[PDB]
Amino acid sequence: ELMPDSGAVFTFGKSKFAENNPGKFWFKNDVPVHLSCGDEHSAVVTGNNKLYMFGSNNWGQLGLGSKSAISKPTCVKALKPEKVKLAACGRNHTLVSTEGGNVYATGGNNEGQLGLGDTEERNTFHVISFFTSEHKIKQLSAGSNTSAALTEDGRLFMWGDNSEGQIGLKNVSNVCVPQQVTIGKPVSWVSCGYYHSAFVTTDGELYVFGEPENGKLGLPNQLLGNHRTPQLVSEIPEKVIQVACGGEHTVVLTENAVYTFGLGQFGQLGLGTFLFETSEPKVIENIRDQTISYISCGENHTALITDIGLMYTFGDGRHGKLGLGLENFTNHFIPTLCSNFLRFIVKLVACGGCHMVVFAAPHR
């Protein structure tokens, strides 16, 4: 009835919820704790360790045992006996991690991204039996036919499509079970974009790999030949903390600044209305006065949450997916404050292909 003090989940764009108008929902005596969004679907993990799925399901990516789109966030009841902790949503698949030590996947599998040892699609969650309780999963990520799981002790495993080097496995075309992708240093963050990926090491270095097009690997030209192995982006001098990868762009959070690179024809690099591409990292000068605590990318837009719970978005405005709440949509070329959320603290965000999902709590 009344929106709880702990807040609500707001959906923007074509999320398949509330007929693609700005939607809102919450849970009875429970709260979201993790959001993820893929190209056309979304996952919410709750504080009581339940998983709720919604969006397109034409590949079985919701894990709900059919292939028809689902309008409403729907609990994956099959997983109720386990404590779901994380999910990631790729283009047509979903990964889930549980506290007991199991990782499961569902959806499209044409390049082996489910990690099940074959390439047959699934429409319910299947276990990836490589992972056990000795893999304490810190983060999951999933791009277009690609998957990643990062452990607390800093090991990174990736699987699915390597057709452009995007899981960092050199000349192998794809793998159907997890493989450790190591450059010999512990990893603290990973992001699978559509056709490229990146990770950040615990000592603050950024490595990028995958399709060497549109500037999005952020590397000087002489290194683009080696795009199938993770390579250091040395042009960022200070310690990197996060990375998020989109369709044709990458966004990087350092202690000092936010940097972007790749192609931003719709504004998603946030570098203004004259510069739409950069093959080397450039600082978003525009928000240098805010402390950014969290970065997120969809296929063609970008979201930033500040340390006080303000959110700024930029890039492709179609369907209202920028989360700005205007009735007339438009591309935005610099970070723009979601002033529709000024009476809230924004706590989590995930960005998808045509949509975005926000968890925000009212000031009162």
């Binding site: 009835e1 849970f27 009875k28 719709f266 209305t273 405005g317 179609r318 007339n328 949509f329 438009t330």
Partner: protein, 180 residues
């Protein structure tokens, strides 16, 4: 259940117009004119203020082979009884009755860096024929229109992509206004 999420409570009677993107031919005069640095696109719909039907941002003039992307979308209410005058404006247009002879005209305008209206210049026009949507019975996404020079209204200088969701409503308007 209470695996239940709580959802609080919350047309062929509307048209949506999107100005998607544009490109210029390299030989067009606008491409060699150094004074023309950035452009926006507008149209005028019945009595809506022009400020509501211009792309809210101006973008750098494209280089050869480049497109710029506005994605500016506007939903226009055409409720059968509150929006009579807008519906009749559209009817006259379908019958080729307006100044532009049955076309919705988009204007591409050069915006000085200082944004002074008195130095804006119309760079070209693109015309969209409404009757075609009525006849075809459907909406084309990223329909590409020639942008034509203001000098003769005929020589192409570029291409403008637009998407209208309008077939359902033009069809309801045509029905209503010929016999109701």
């Amino acid at each position: 259940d209470s695996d239940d999420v709580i959802v609080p409570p919350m047309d062929s009677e509307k048209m949506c117009i999107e100005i998607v993107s544009l490109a210029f031919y390299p030989e067009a005069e606008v491409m060699s004119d150094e004074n023309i640095k950035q452009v926006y696109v507008e149209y005028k719909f019945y009595d809506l203020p022009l400020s509501e039907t211009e792309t809210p941002v101006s973008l750098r003039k494209p280089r050869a082979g480049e497109e710029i992307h506005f994605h500016f979308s506007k939903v226009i209410d055409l409720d059968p009884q509150e929006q009579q005058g807008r519906r009749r404006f559209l009817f006259d247009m379908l019958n080729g009755q307006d100044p532009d002879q049955g076309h919705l005209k988009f204007t591409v305008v050069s915006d000085p860096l200082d944004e002074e209206k008195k130095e804006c210049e119309e760079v070209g026009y693109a015309y969209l024929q409404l009757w075609q949507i009525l006849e075809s019975g459907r909406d084309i996404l990223e329909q590409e229109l020639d942008i034509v020079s203001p000098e003769d209204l005929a020589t192409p200088i570029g291409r403008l992509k637009v998407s209208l969701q309008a077939a359902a409503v033009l069809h309801a308007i045509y029905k209503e206004m010929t016999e109701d």
